[PDB]
């Protein structure tokens, strides 16, 4: 599963 940090990376890329 994606790490929390990897989900944050996705959020800040798209927002």
């Amino acid at each position: 599963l994606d790490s929390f940090k990897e989900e944050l990376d996705k959020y800040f890329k798209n927002h």
Partner: antibody, heavy 118, light 111 residues
Framework: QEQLVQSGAEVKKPGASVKVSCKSSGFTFSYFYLHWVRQAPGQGLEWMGIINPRGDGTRYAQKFQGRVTMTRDASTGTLYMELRSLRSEDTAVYYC???????????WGQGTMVTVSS | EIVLTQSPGTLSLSPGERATLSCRASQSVRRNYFAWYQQKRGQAPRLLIYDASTRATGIPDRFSGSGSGTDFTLTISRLEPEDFAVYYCQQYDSSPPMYIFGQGTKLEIKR
């Protein structure tokens, strides 16, 4: 040896602003998301916001948006919180914290006491 | 907004006894993004448990956590003097970033 060390105690008048600093040692500063958390006298912990590793992305707790600015300086390895339009209810200890890859706060600074009074 | 309710507010126990601390989330905690912290008087908090049940490095193995969904528990199997402190639970999410703390449980020495 993984550490966060914060600047010293602050005393401010209402309406002023304060900029607290937090300098890392013992790890790669630019790899990590960083946070500020505060704790009013006798109260619990309150997350203030997060800044991304590059420093170009932040997200703040709804309570502090419009009043807080979080920045980081890769050249000095230092994280900053500026809180504006201070009121006495901003009297608190302010902590910086490192976000681990799993998201929880695994390294904490020692805290900076901020007193806001007339 | 999610709200984390800790129980009890104060827990009075003697050294050597087992401590059970509870946290209830007002809605389901995505991916068990859940942590426990200890805070001794005049000190910064320290991470004890993350992912609801994983002990952080260097934390004594008398600390353990469990739970999922809305109900989470921190257990101290046998209390030592250094364990009497305030304990906070924490919930978090990544998209969008949000971090919420329980209101704290004071673990007090019962004489």
């Amino acid at each position: 040896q993984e550490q966060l060390v914060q600047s010293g105690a602050e005393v401010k008048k209402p309406g002023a602003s304060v900029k607290v600093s937090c300098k890392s040692s013992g790890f790669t500063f630019s790899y990590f998301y960083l946070h500020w958390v505060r704790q009013a006298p006798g109260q619990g912990l309150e997350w203030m916001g997060i800044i991304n590793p590059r420093g170009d992305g932040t997200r703040y707790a709804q309570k502090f948006q419009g009043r807080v600015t979080m920045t980081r300086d890769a050249s000095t390895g230092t994280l900053y919180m500026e809180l504006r339009s201070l009121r006495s209810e901003d009297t608190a200890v302010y902590y910086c914290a490192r976000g681990a890859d799993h998201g929880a706060f695994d390294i904490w600074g020692q805290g900076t006491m901020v007193t806001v009074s007339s | 907004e999610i709200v984390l309710t800790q129980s009890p507010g104060t827990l009075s126990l003697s050294p050597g006894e087992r401590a059970t601390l509870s946290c209830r989330a007002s809605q389901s905690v995505r991916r068990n993004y859940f942590a426990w912290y200890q805070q001794k008087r005049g000190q910064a908090p320290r991470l004890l448990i993350y992912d609801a049940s994983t002990r952080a490095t260097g934390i004594p193995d008398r600390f353990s956590g469990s739970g999922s969904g809305t109900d989470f528990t921190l257990t101290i199997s046998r209390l030592e003097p250094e364990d009497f402190a305030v304990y906070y639970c924490q919930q978090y999410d990544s998209s969008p970033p949000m971090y919420i703390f329980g209101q704290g449980t004071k673990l007090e020495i019962k004489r």
